[PDB]
Amino acid sequence: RAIGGGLSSVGGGSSTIKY
């Protein structure tokens, strides 16, 4: 669809904030 985003496309790193 037009919402074809993808969390795996996120850059800068996710776990960098260390939950």
Percent helix, strand, coil in the chain, to 5, is 30, 0, 70
Chain breaks in the chain following residues, C–N > 2.5 Å: none
Residues in Cβ contact with 2 at an 8 Å cutoff, skipping those fewer than 6 apart: none
How far apart, in whole angstroms, are the C-alpha atoms of residue 19 and residue 17? 6
- Amino acid in position 18: K
User: From which experimental method does this structure derive?
Assistant: NMR
- Amino acid in position 3: I
CA angle 19, 8, 5 (to 5 degrees): 115
In the 8-state DSSP scheme, what is residue 2? T
Task: Give the SS3 label for residue 14.
Answer: coil
Rg (CA), the chain: 11
